[PDB]
Each structure stands twice: as structure tokens, then as C-alpha cells.
Amino acid sequence: RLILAMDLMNRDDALRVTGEVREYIDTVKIGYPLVLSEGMDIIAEFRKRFGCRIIADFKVADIPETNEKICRATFKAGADAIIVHGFPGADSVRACLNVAEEMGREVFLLTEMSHPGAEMFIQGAADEIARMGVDLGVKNYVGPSTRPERLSRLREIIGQDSFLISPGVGAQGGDPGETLRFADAIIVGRSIYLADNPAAAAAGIIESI
Amino acid sequence: RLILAMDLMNRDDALRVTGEVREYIDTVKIGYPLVLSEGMDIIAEFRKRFGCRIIADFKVADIPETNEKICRATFKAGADAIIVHGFPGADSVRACLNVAEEMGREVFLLTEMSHPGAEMFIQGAADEIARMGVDLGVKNYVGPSTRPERLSRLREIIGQDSFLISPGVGAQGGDPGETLRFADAIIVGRSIYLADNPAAAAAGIIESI
Numbered sequence: 225r226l227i228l229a230m231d232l233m234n235r236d237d238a239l240r241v242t243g244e245v246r247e248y249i250d251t252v253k254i255g256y257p258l259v260l261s262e263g264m265d266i267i268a269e270f271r272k273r274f275g276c277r278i279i280a281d282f283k284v285a286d287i288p289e290t291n292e293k294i295c296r297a298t299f300k301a302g303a304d305a306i307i308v309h310g311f312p313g314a315d316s317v318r319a320c321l322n323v324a325e326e327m328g329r330e331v332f333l334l335t336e337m338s339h340p341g342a343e344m345f346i347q348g349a350a351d352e353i354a355r356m357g358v359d360l361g362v363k364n365y366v367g368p369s370t371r372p373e374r375l376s377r378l379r380e381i382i383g384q385d386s387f388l389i390s391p392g393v394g395a396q397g398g399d400p401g402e403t404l405r406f407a408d409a410i411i412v413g414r415s416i417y418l419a420d421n422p423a424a425a426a427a428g429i430i431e432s433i
Numbered sequence: 434r435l436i437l438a439m440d441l442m443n444r445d446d447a448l449r450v451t452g453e454v455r456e457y458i459d460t461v462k463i464g465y466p467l468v469l470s471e472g473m474d475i476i477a478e479f480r481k482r483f484g485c486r487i488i489a490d491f492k493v494a495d496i497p498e499t500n501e502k503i504c505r506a507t508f509k510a511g512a513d514a515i516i517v518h519g520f521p522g523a524d525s526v527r528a529c530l531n532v533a534e535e536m537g538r539e540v541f542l543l544t545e546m547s548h549p550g551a552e553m554f555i556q557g558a559a560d561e562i563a564r565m566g567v568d569l570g571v572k573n574y575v576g577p578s579t580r581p582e583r584l585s586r587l588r589e590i591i592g593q594d595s596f597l598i599s600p601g602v603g604a605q606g607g608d609p610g611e612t613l614r615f616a617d618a619i620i621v622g623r624s625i626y627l628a629d630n631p632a633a634a635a636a637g638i639i640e641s642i
């Protein structure tokens with residue numbers, strides 16, 4: 225129930241830390257901090273080297289036509305799933321779902337975000353974004369560890385069968401145990417990758433739950 | 434007043450079309466369709482080969498800490514400016530502005546989007562996103578060619594001194610002339626890059642205005 229957010233920017237460090245904590249995870253979330261620094265080939269390298277599933281956290285948030293192109297390039301690169309913003313609307317999300325269907329991959333819909341600024345505009349639209357996901361057939365979602373009451377409401381909307389992962393654990397203030405009352409898995413970045421001993425940090429999280 | 438949205442996915446085609454229309458533009462918008470296919474080095478290559486300013490259209494839409502990393506990698510790659518979503522809130526936008534200040538670069542704030550789905554959630558928050566930009570000191574904005582009445586309202590909020598660029602011209606239905614009544618420059622992608630003669634398409638747009 226632990227997903228590593230590998231946001232280190234250099235390949236050697238990213239490979240070192242991921243290898244050190246492999247026994248505690250099975251899924252690695254790779255985003256733009258690593259991809260824009262080392263290239264899209266890093267996805268296939270990780271997939272092969274560690275045998276872990278890769279979620280490409282690209283927060284896709286463009287018009288339908290561009291979203292289609294982004295998803296196609298991402299799945300061609302070997303990603304198992306891609307995270308997509310729901311705020312740009314149903315057509316933009318559907319474009320991602322269509323490419324995922326064509327390529328036998330998955331889409332994760334980001335509903336409410338975990339940082340303070342999410343309260344400004346995203347929070348007020350989050351319940352509706354989650355309902356839109358349900359209506360579009362989305363089965364994978366992302367919700368905030370920093371607001372468990374919101375994570376609870378989001379879980380209520382998507383149902384128990386939907387898969388929900390949650391970032392904001394550790395560095396941002398979220399708690400592993402409380403978050404897992406509602407989410408199926410927690411995403412952890414800095415608490416593990418900036419630790420003096422990443423494996424010890426990961427093991428500690430796995431034990432606390 | 435014409436910016437090329439270079440969304441072709443292969444380097445050879447992208448280089449061919451951009452070179453053919455160079456005399457009609459001075460700024461190229463490069464997004465993820467090209468970057469995720471050919472790598473971040475394509476930005477410096479274009480900048481050197483064509484001597485054009487490059488706007489990295491990455492629709493940055495993450496938490497502050499990740500946005501900082503994305504902006505740093507993007508400016509290190511040579512981009513002159515980066516497009517950032519305002520929907521995730523002020524802290525996320527400020528993180529981008531701080532990196533731009535540190536690196537002597539610019540941030541463009543995306544307010545309302547041009548596609549149909551933008552009406553679902555973005556449109557209702559767009560005026561407030563634009564006001565947030567003004568309050569944060571943002572001087573560069575993106576608004577929709579497909580809704581000139583909204584582009585007018587956005588221009589009203591940001592003032593005449595702010596720089597406003599606008600996509601949705603051509604393929605999405607927007608008109609060059611009407612859009613330029615409010616925007617300083619128009620962004621055009623498919624109408625030019627999918628044309629049998631891109632230079633002829635660009636020249637035709639430049640003439641119609």
C-alpha cells in the first residue's frame with residue numbers, strides 16, 4: 225500500500241534510492257522532475273530494472289487533442305498508467321481514456337490536490353470532478369492525505385471498488401494510518417528519498433501501518 | 434503577432450515546418466507532444482537553429498515544490514518562458530514566479546482554456562484566476578480565441594500593459610482578426626503545421642490581419 229514518488233532529478237540518485245526501497249514497494253510514481261531531467265527513456269529503464277509498475281504523474285491538463293498526444297507518447301514510453309487533471313473538463317479526460325483503452329493502459333483522475341492552494345479553486349470543484357470520473361467510467365483516483373475529511377467524501381463518491389491513491393503523506397503533513405482509512409495506497413516522496421536511510425524510512429512507514 | 438504551436442511529434446517534421454514559416458513568426462510554442470517524443474534538448478536546438486524565442490507550454494499544474502523543479506528544468510533547457518495553470522492556486526503560481534525571477538525568465542498564466550470542456554470548471558474560476566495573476570505581479574497571460582467575449586473580460590482584468598496571447602485560432606474555430614482585438618498575439622498550430630503549404634498558410638493569416 226506504499227507508492228514511491230521518485231522526484232529526484234538525477235538518474236544515479238533516482239536509481240540508487242529506488243533500488244534501496246524496492247522490497248517495500250511495487251509501484252513507482254515518476255513525474256516531470258525526473259523525466260524532464262533524464263528523458264522519457266527513464267520509464268522503461270525503471271520498469272525493467274526494478275520490475276515495478278510505473279505511474280507517469282504528468283497532471284495532464286490540456287485540450288483533448290493535445291492530451292491524446294501526451295498520453296500516446298507516455299504509454300509508448302512504457303508507463304502503466306498516467307495521472308490526469310479533471311479540472312479541464314470531461315472532454316479532456318475522455319481523450320486520455322480513449323488512448324488508454326487503445327493501448328491497454330490506465331488513467332488515474334486527480335480530484336482534489338494536497339497543497340494549501342488547492343483550497344482556492346480545486347476543492348470547490350472536487351466533488352463534481354469525482355462524479356464526472358464515475359460517469360466517465362474512471363476506476364482510479366487521486367485524493368489528498370492532508371484533508372482526510374475530503375478523502376472520505378471522495379471515497380464516498382467513487383465507491384469501494386474504485387482504486388484511490390493519496391499523496392501528501394509525511395513532508396506535507398499527512399498521516400499514513402489515517403489516510404489508509406480511506407485510500408487504498410499512499411504516495412510518499414521526500415520522507416523517503418531525502419532520508420539519510422531511505423530503506424529505513426520506508427520500513428518505518430510500512431511498520432507504522 | 435503570430436506564435437507557432439509546434440505540436441508535431443517528430444523532430445524532422447517539426448524542424449521542416451518551423452524553418453518554412455520562420456519569416457512569419459519570431460516565437461515558437463513548444464509543448465509536451467514534441468518534448469516527450471524528442472527530448473528537452475529540442476528547445477535549445479530550436480532556439481539556436483531559428484533564433485526564435487521559445488515558450489515551453491507545459492501547463493504546470495502541480496504542488497509548489499514540484500512546480501519549482503519543473504520550472505528549473507525547463508529554464509535550464511533554455512526556454513524563455515513557461516505556461517502555468519492558475520487553477521491549482523496562488524502558492525503553485527508563486528513557486529513558478531520565484532524560479533523565473535531567479536533565472537531571469539518569464540511565466541505566462543493560463544486563465545480560461547479554449548476547448549468545450551473549459552466551460553465545466555475553468556470558466557467559472559477564470560476571472561478570479563486572472564485577478565490572482567494581477568495580485569501576484571504576473572504580466573503575461575493566455576486566454577481563449579474561441580470565446581472573444583471572455584477574452585475581452587480577461588483583458589479588462591489584466592489591463593492594457595499586460596501581454597496576452599491566445600490559442601484556438603483556426604482548427605478550434607477562432608478568428609485571427611477578432612482575437613487580436615483583445616490579444617496581443619495569436620497562437621496557431623494545426624492550421625499551419627498540417628497545411629499542405631505551411632508557409633502559405635502562415636502568410637495567409639498574416640495577410641488577413
Ligand SMILES: O=c1cc(O)n([C@@H]2O[C@H](COP(=O)(O)O)[C@@H](O)[C@H]2O)c(=O)[nH]1
Pocket residue numbers: 229231255281334336337338339366367368391392393394395396411412413414415495496499
Ligand atoms: O495533490 C497532489 C497530487 C500529486 O500528484 N502530488 C505529488 O505527489 C508527490 C508527493 O511528494 P512528497 O511525499 O515529497 O510531498 C509529488 O510528486 C507531488 O507532485 C502531491 O503532492 N499532491
Ligand SMILES: O=c1cc(O)n([C@@H]2O[C@H](COP(=O)(O)O)[C@@H](O)[C@H]2O)c(=O)[nH]1
Pocket residue numbers: 286287290438440464490543545546547548575576577600601602603604605620621622623624
Ligand atoms: O486554452 C488553451 C491553451 C493552450 O495552450 N492551447 C494549446 O495551443 C495549441 C493550439 O493548437 P491548434 O491551433 O492546433 O488548435 C496547442 O498546442 C494547445 O495545447 C489550446 O489549444 N487551448
